[PDB]
């Protein structure tokens, strides 16, 4: 046998290995949310802080891969770290190479080269852990994509990652089939509406942490506490 | 369990207490270590006449003064007997004196686990500064010096008997013919020249075969 | 073991597994007309959330390669990847040839690193090849474990055996123009569950004078009048 | 029981060597029949989908140097990667020694490859078994018959085919050494490829067939085309209607 | 039970199975004991026999003048072992011209040592030193066990039917730091004595000592050698 | 069980063993010592229409006065050969005196034993053997078993039929019935003729005489010696 | 699950009975769940010995004493004060 | 179960790696661990088993000096612990040989996390059974303090327990109010947790090994001078 157990197809003509790590990204008990705007791509994730003997400074899941280029990582802790660092490896290593910066879309794909190596071969095992990452691109405006341990790397304006993942893209689908561009107030709050409606406790301004990126304003801003608290006073008006 | 490498749950990792039982399926060998020299004796055990009595050796001279005699896959004895010889004459080109026979037996037992386990046991005899010496090496990679020792098939066996004909100011002349009478009762057949090798230490002598046929003058008083 | 492998008797069971996952379900016809060669396939994306200008199912491999897929879609990143590298590899060693339809029987014998060294675990996605520098054109496709087959008109989706059916039905035939993606359109058709539209369907086409993956106002264009 | 590649049997037979070389029975066909001034082979065309353009100009039939060419049976893959390896080795015994390499040598290195794949390591058996027909200086014309096993064998009348048994016997019935020509191994070659497939009156397309000649000192490896293929069809044709009726 | 088979796998009840059998290699082996003082340490070793014709075998082994160790069970990964001390130490004299102190060689020890127990196909070292040194602070005496966790101690005994010899050298480690170098020795000849049975008796053939002090190099002292330390053996077997 | 090169519970080597009882499938191989000539034969009855005889080669020269002959797998045997004769064309450039015939089969030996050792290469599958005139007049004749070793035979009797023409060979195998060259051959005969039918050309002799070159002995004379035989065999009613 | 049934049914019906059930760790598993063994099939035994504890609440007669070695390998099932609660 | 916790590289039915599950059942077994991040410092203590008194004075010590300023208290599987120290000190060595001055804690944390990420994600390899505290102080950077689990990623610690009672200490942890508390009174309240913690209840007596780093070392993360918080070991026990 052994078909569900090492990184080889099935006799069904399946491959269950990458479809058990999909699942370890549910796994963990996060959720997270990718909304591209009209020129913006906001991400928030909630913070379950445990106790507050832990510091909320460092507990985040949100990242700067490089100056432009932000990430938001979904399922265990460990495999995400290190895809973060490699991330990070690959932005440096290609801005080294190439002069200009890398292009968000190109790192999801190379991450998502690498994802798909770690699920070929049978000595290592992939990474259970779903990185979304947003940047802004010049000719392209902002660019959200998303990476699975699967290799395949894709996803756009509205995208959720996440235990109750599905419940999140079904009501950014009804947001976005609702035909109005978001700006950068209308962008933030689909996204905090989206999660609150996903888990229902209000979102007290210090268990989200929402990482944002605008055409105007470049660079992956990791908003204090004080603007996801404005922003949360906005919404709720 | 089956791994080579893996331990057993009681005491001891296996597979190589499956090869330290291939002296089992190896013939006899008793070699005895007296004041006067080192008597080794084993039987050829030759299955047909039509192969040459000389072909089969279980004795073999690893240097001028130092003797091996193997028990068990003679196959892995060619290997463990070249890199003693290799060994002792590097020690002799980079020291120029005489390998210790205990230096020998030290590194062939280093060299026997570093690869499936050697399944041979090997009797070294020599002579040294310390007088006459033996040892018996043993698949385990595992040497303990020895003054009368018997391998092989039968181990146990000669090794009691060995135990009391024994004693420890005899001669060679006494050791030679103990260790062909313990032979005759070991072994099925008689102990004929064509079937019987014998290698003998000195202290002022290379350790050549023993006589060569002629050596009935030891067998006809056994 | 580190190879393509797993062959008992008579059989090649982890092929035929991986030829059982390139089943898959998207169809990605291709066509060999007598002016060149056409290779469309189609993107059902999940619900509107996904892009279809994000990702692509055609990909040129160089000036006239293309190339369309099957199931295995990031394996297929990989596969697309080690053509380039090969074809460009080809290309300068034997420098300024514009190989690529004399390439495109050389680039597809070189798909062995695709399968005869499996990597383990074989690749899962089976791939049709265009190319149009030779005076005429070429359609081949490899699969997870064979090699070229130099094909006509051919499907590799959930409804292939119905799709190739509908293929020799409506006569591939020889004397058809550059505008058979008509017809491929049409077999997509067969396979297709929905209204297809531009960025619903992905076409690319090789003709002599090179290879163009069509954008949606010409795709949106051939699919208005069917 | 099967295991590992590098194992041996209870009795102490390689059982997945002798599956997979009884597995080459399985699938293709192909046949060699060697005569004076001329040395050909005969292929079946197993899948004749109208779908294909046949413009690689060769599946069964490879040449793999000046002076040889050989026949695969087994599965593609290995076999792609088995006349490379080929041809590598003869264009390197080329660039060693400036002659072109006697065919008995080149079956040797190709089977010592074979041998060596399934001697050692954790690597499977080239599923393959091939036929080759080359000229020598030292032997002339030659034909041999290597197996996955890594046994090669010199033969003059043989089949690797899934009637490979039917065909070999076919052959045995019908044929005679020295009076042997090109046009009669052709005969004979079309009539044993449509004894041992099914459908009488074989088209010219499902049978793929090369002859390797003698010119004028160079060796000349034609495969024969469509034309000429049915050509030697009529002719086998007219004297089965003779044969038969003449009773 | 499958989760004992390989080094590797972790047993889900916790600690893994196959070091914990490692251990059971020093307990099927024959005792020795070692035991520290104010300026000296002692090793007193059974050198077990195979017969009455053959040698005892050897034990306390030779590192260095300062270092002297005593092995207990799997002989053959233990040579091995004495030679990658003697190496290291060797190493210390070439370097900086000073003896090795026992707890770096001992610490070095366990890394080398643990390395196996981490990786496949790598059977962890079975085999049991108690190591005896002077460094500048005095003796000690040191025990490695396979599971590369060792320890520092006043005076440990391991080997077949050691806890009784444990149990006596526990009981009067109270006057160990004030004895005579015979009277040390003679309490750990009892502490050997008492783990035979009582037909077993200690000999000059089948004993070792492996005496190092402050101005005493290294020494391993036998039949001849031991007779003086036996004499006033106070036999109660 | 187990069926790989490692020691079994009761010794052994269980795929040696199965490689050496692979030499019965194969044919019987006979050859023969005598002080004037070595001659050995191999008996083939094999032979399609269709194949050609001269590629059968199942005895083959190394060095023009060393011959082997063939009992088991053909590939594995033909591989020993390769390898062997560049050995001795290397002990011939080194060591400029010719191989000798103790030598090669110690190589040969060599070869099988390193094979043997490690699970990685499988145990070589044949049972060579060795005849030929050594550079001191002397001709010899050894014979190498799969496993690891070689046994200098007056008779080899190696294939199919082994023990039946080896018990033959041993009951009369008269030194005065070897004396001449031709009653050399004519013992050979009459041994080998008695395995299976050996009727019209069935045997296939080697002869190596003192420094002449390996001569292959042509079908009518092979039926001459067969009627000689048959001659030898009448008046004796 | 029914020889524990008729175990109290006979200490019902003879006098206020000793019920003295051994190897409770045996009976009950700390819930340890690996695909190994999940105590699936003896979670029926347990709770059957659960829903019996009380049938004698009335009138308290037959008491119920379990013995074992190691209480840990328990869930809090069989720990609570209706039921098992005197742990010595 | 069965086939799915057999090696690491093998995903559960459910998306989870057994192996590194059953690693934290060791670090749960093994004694725990205590760290607090004081007002100006960070303070450490663990109770370690006296499994016989034939050892000598604290041997094999919880405790390990990583670096100048960092120190790790660690518990579990105590010679792959070591090792894992012993990475560490050359992660260190390395920082400092390449990019000059002394390592942050959270780079530190972070690489050596990662390194126990790659000894978790492959298959010949095993997680590494063990837990630690890194604790450290600068001026600059004030005190920090990270724990790694056998298999998970380093996380900011005000306070943190790991071993065998985790919980229980952690309850008196929070309710210890740090932040503004000295780590005088800091060492005195978590030499008070651990013998709070039982120690011979059911095991065997137990010693007190206590790590300092702060302003009031200037760094230089050393042990705690045990002669003189005898007495705050006194304080503990009343």
């Not at chain 1, 080294?96 to 071969?121: F, H, W």
């Not at chain 2, 013939?27 to 270590?33: E, R, V, Y």
């Not at chain 4, 019935?173 to 070659?189: I, N, P, V």
């Not at chain 5, 060797?90 to 610490?107: A, M, N």
Request: glycine share 6%; with cysteine.
């Amino acid at each position: 046998g052994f078909d569900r157990h090492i990184t080889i197809f099935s006799p069904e003509g399946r491959l269950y290995q990458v479809e058990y790590a999909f699942k370890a990204i549910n796994q963990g008990g996060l959720t997270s949310v990718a909304v591209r705007g009209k020129d913006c791509a906001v991400i928030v994730t909630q913070k379950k802080v445990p106790d507050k003997l832990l510091d909320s400074s460092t507990v985040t899941h949100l990242f700067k891969i490089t100056e432009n280029i932000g990430c938001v990582m979904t399922g265990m802790t460990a495999d995400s770290r290190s895809q973060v660092q490699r991330a990070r490896y690959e932005a440096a290593n290609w801005k080294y190479k190439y002069g200009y910066e890398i292009p968000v879309d190109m790192l999801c794909k190379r991450i998502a080269d690498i994802s798909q190596v770690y699920t070929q071969n049978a000595e290592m095992r992939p990474l259970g852990c779903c990185m979304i990452l947003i940047g802004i691109d010049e000719e392209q405006g902002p660019q959200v994509y998303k990476c699975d341990p699967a290799g395949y790397y894709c996803g756009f304006k509205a995208t959720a990652a996440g235990v109750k993942q599905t419940e999140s893209t079904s009501f950014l689908e009804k947001k976005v089939k609702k035909k109005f561009d978001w700006t950068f107030e209308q962008t933030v709050e689909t996204a905090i509406t989206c999660l609150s409606t996903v888990l229902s406790i209000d979102f007290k301004p210090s268990e989200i942490e929402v990482g944002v990126v605008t055409v105007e304003n470049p660079k992956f801003r990791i908003l204090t506490e004080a603007e996801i608290d404005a922003h949360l006073v906005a919404l709720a008006e | 369990d089956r791994g080579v490498n893996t331990f057993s749950p009681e005491g001891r990792l296996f597979q190589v207490e499956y090869a330290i039982e291939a002296i089992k399926l190896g013939s006899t060998a008793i070699g005895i270590q007296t004041s006067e020299g080192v008597c080794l004796a084993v039987e050829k055990r030759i299955t047909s006449p039509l192969m040459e009595p000389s072909s089969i050796e279980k004795i073999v001279e690893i240097d001028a003064h130092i003797g091996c005699a193997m028990s068990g896959l003679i196959a892995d004895a060619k290997t463990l007997i070249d890199k003693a010889r290799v060994e002792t004459q590097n020690h002799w080109f980079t020291y120029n004196e005489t390998m210790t026979v205990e230096s020998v037996t030290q590194a062939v037992s280093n060299l026997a686990l570093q690869s499936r386990p050697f399944g041979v046991a090997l009797l070294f005899g020599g002579v040294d500064e310390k007088g006459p010496q033996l040892f018996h090496m043993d698949p385990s990679g595992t040497f303990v010096q020895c003054d009368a020792r018997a391998i092989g098939s039968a181990s146990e066996g000669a090794q009691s008997s060995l135990q009391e004909v024994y004693h420890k100011s005899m001669t060679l002349k006494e050791a030679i013919k103990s260790s062909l009478i313990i032979l005759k009762q070991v072994m099925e057949e008689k102990l004929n020249a064509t079937n019987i090798e014998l290698a003998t230490v000195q202290p002022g002598q290379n350790f050549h075969m023993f006589t060569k046929e002629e050596l009935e003058e030891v067998i006809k008083d056994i | 073991f580190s190879l393509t492998t797993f062959s008992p008797s008579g059989k090649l069971v982890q092929i035929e597994y991986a030829l059982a996952a390139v089943a898959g379900g998207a169809p990605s016809v291709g066509i060999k007309a007598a002016n060149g060669v056409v290779l469309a396939t189609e993107k059902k994306q999940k619900s509107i959330l996904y892009d279809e200008r994000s990702v692509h199912k055609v990909e040129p491999i160089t000036k006239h390669i293309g190339l369309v897929y099957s199931g295995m879609g990031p394996d297929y990143r990989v596969l697309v990847h080690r053509a380039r590298k090969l074809a460009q590899q080809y290309y300068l060693v034997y420098q300024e040839p514009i190989p690529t339809a004399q390439l495109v029987q050389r680039v597809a014998s070189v798909m062995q690193e695709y399968t005869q060294s499996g990597g383990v675990r074989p690749f899962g996605v089976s791939l049709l090849i265009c190319g149009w520098n030779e005076g005429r054109p070429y359609l081949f496709q490899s699969d997870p474990s064979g090699a070229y087959f130099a094909w006509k008109a051919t499907a590799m989706g959930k409804n292939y055996v119905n799709g190739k059916t509908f293929l020799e039905k409506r006569y591939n035939e020889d004397l058809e123009l550059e505008d058979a993606i008509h017809t491929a359109i049409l077999t997509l058709k067969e396979s297709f569950e929905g209204q297809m539209t531009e960025d619903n369907i992905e076409v690319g086409i090789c003709n002599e004078a090179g290879f163009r993956r069509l954008t949606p106002t010409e795709v949106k264009d051939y699919l208005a009048a069917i | 029981y099967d295991s590992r590649t590098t194992i041996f049997s209870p009795e102490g037979r390689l059982y997945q060597v002798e599956y997979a070389m009884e597995a080459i029975g399985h699938a293709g066909t192909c046949l060699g029949i060697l005569a004076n001034d001329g040395v050909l082979l005969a292929a079946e065309r197993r899948n004749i989908h109208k779908l294909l353009d046949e413009v690689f100009f060769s599946e069964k039939i490879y040449k793999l140097n000046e002076d040889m060419a050989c026949s695969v049976a087994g599965i593609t893959s290995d076999a792609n990667v088995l006349t490379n390896e080929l041809r590598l080795i003869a264009q390197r015994y080329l660039l060693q020694y400036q002659e072109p390499i006697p065919c008995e040598q080149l079956v040797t290195a190709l089977c010592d490859i074979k041998q060596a794949y399934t001697q050692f390591g954790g690597k499977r058996p080239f599923g393959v078994s091939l036929l080759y027909i080359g000229w020598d200086k030292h032997y002339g014309f030659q034909l041999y018959q290597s197996d996955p096993s890594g046994n090669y064998g010199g033969w003059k009348a043989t089949c690797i085919g899934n009637n490979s048994a039917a065909a070999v016997s076919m052959l045995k019935q019908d044929y005679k050494e020295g009076e042997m020509t090109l046009k009669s191994a052709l005969a004979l070659a079309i009539k044993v490829l449509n004894k041992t497939m099914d459908v009488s009156k074989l088209s010219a397309e499902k049978v793929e067939i090369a002859t390797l000649t003698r010119e004028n000192g160079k060796t000349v490896i034609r495969v024969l085309k469509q034309k000429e293929v049915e050509q030697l069809i009529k002719k086998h044709e007219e004297e089965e209607a003779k044969a038969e009726r003449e009773k | 039970n499958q989760y004992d088979n390989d080094v590797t796998v972790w047993s889900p009840q916790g600690r893994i199975h196959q070091i914990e059998y490692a251990m059971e290699a020093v307990k099927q082996g024959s005792a020795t004991v070692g035991l520290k003082s104010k300026t000296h340490a002692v090793l007193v070793a059974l050198k077990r026999a195979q017969s009455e014709l053959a040698a005892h075998q050897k034990k306390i082994l030779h590192v260095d003048n300062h270092i002297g160790i005593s092995i207990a069970g799997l002989t053959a990964d233990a040579r091995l072992l004495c030679n990658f001390m003697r190496q290291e130490c060797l190493d210390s004299r070439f370097v900086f011209d000073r003896p090795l102190p026992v707890s770096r060689l001992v610490s070095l020890i366990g890394s080398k040592t643990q390395i196996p127990t981490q990786r496949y196909g790598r059977r962890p070292y079975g085999v049991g030193l108690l190591i005896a040194g002077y460094d500048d602070m005095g003796p000690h005496i040191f025990q490695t066990c396979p599971s590369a966790n060792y320890f520092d101690c006043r005076a440990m005994s391991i080997g077949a039917r050691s806890q009784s010899a444990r149990t006596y050298l526990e009981r009067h480690m109270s006057e160990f730091m004030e004895c005579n170098l015979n009277e040390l020795v003679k309490h750990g000849l009892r502490a050997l004595r008492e783990t035979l049975p009582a037909e077993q008796d200690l000999t000059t053939k089948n004993v070792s000592i492996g005496i190092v002090g402050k101005d005493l190099e290294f020494t391993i002292y036998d039949d001849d050698d031991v007779s003086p330390f036996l004499e006033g053996l106070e036999e109660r077997p | 069980d187990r069926a790989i090169t490692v020691f079994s519970p009761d010794g052994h080597l269980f795929q040696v063993e199965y490689a050496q009882e692979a030499v019965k499938k194969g044919s019987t191989a006979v050859g023969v010592r005598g002080r004037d000539i070595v001659v050995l034969g191999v008996e083939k009855k094999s032979v399609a229409k269709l194949q050609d005889e001269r590629t059968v080669r199942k005895i083959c020269a190394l060095d023009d006065n060393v011959c082997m002959a063939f009992a088991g797998l053909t590939a594995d045997a033909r591989i020993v050969i390769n390898r062997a004769r560049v050995e001795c064309q290397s002990h011939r450039l080194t060591v400029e005196d010719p191989v000798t015939v103790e030598y090669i089969t110690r190589y040969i030996a060599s070869l099988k034993q390193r094979y043997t050792q490690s699970n990685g290469r499988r145990p070589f599958g044949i049972s060579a053997l060795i005849v030929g005139f050594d550079f001191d007049g002397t001709p010899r004749l050894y014979q190498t078993d799969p496993s690891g070793t070689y046994h200098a035979w007056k008779a080899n009797a190696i294939g199919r039929g082994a023990k039946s023409v080896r018990e033959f060979l041993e009951k009369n195998y008269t030194d005065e019935a070897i004396e001449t060259d031709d009653l050399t051959i004519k013992l050979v005969i009459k041994a080998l003729l008695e395995v299976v039918q050996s009727g019209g050309k069935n045997i296939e002799l080697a002869v190596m005489r003192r420094d002449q070159s390996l001569k292959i002995l042509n079908p009518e004379e092979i039926e001459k010696y067969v009627a000689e035989i048959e001659k030898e065999k009448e008046e004796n009613e | 699950a029914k020889l524990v049934r008729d175990a109290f049914a006979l200490a019902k019906e003879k006098a206020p009975s000793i019920i003295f059930i051994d190897e409770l760790d045996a009976i009950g598993t700390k819930r340890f769940d690996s695909e190994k063994a999940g105590d699936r099939e003896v979670q029926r035994t347990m709770l059957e010995l659960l829903n019996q504890l009380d049938g004698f609440q009335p009138n308290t007669q037959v008491k119920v004493i379990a013995a074992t070695n190691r209480v840990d390998i328990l869930d809090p099932a069989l720990l609570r004060s209706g039921r098992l609660d005197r742990k010595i | 179960g069965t086939g799915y916790d057999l090696s690491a590289s093998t995903f559960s039915p459910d998306g989870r790696v057994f192996q590194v599950e059953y690693a934290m059942k060791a670090v749960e077994n093994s004694s725990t661990a205590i760290g607090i991040r004081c007002k100006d410092g960070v303070v450490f203590g663990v109770e370690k088993l006296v499994l016989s008194k034939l050892y000598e004075e604290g041997s094999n010590k919880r405790l390990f000096n990583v670096d100048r300023h960092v120190g790790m208290a660690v518990a579990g599987l105590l010679a792959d612990a070591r090792s894992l120290a012993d990475i560490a000190r050359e992660e260190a060595s390395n920082f400092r040989s390449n990019f000059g001055y002394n390592i942050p804690l959270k780079h530190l944390a972070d690489r050596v996390a990662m390194y126990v990420h790659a000894y978790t994600l492959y298959s010949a390899v095993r997680p590494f059974g063990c837990s630690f505290m890194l604790g450290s102080y600068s001026v600059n950077d004030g005190a920090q303090l990270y724990m790694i689990d056998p298999s998970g990623v380093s996380y900011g610690y005000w306070g943190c327990a790991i071993g065998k009672a985790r919980q229980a200490a952690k309850t008196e942890i929070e309710k210890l109010q740090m932040k503004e508390m000295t780590c005088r009174d800091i060492v005195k309240e978590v030499a008070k947790i651990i013998y709070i913690v039982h120690d011979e209840v059911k095991d065997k007596a137990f010693e007190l090994e206590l790590s300092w780093v702060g302003e009031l070392t200037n760094g230089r993360h050393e042990i705690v001078p045990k002669d003189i918080r005898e007495e705050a070991e006194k304080y503990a026990k009343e």
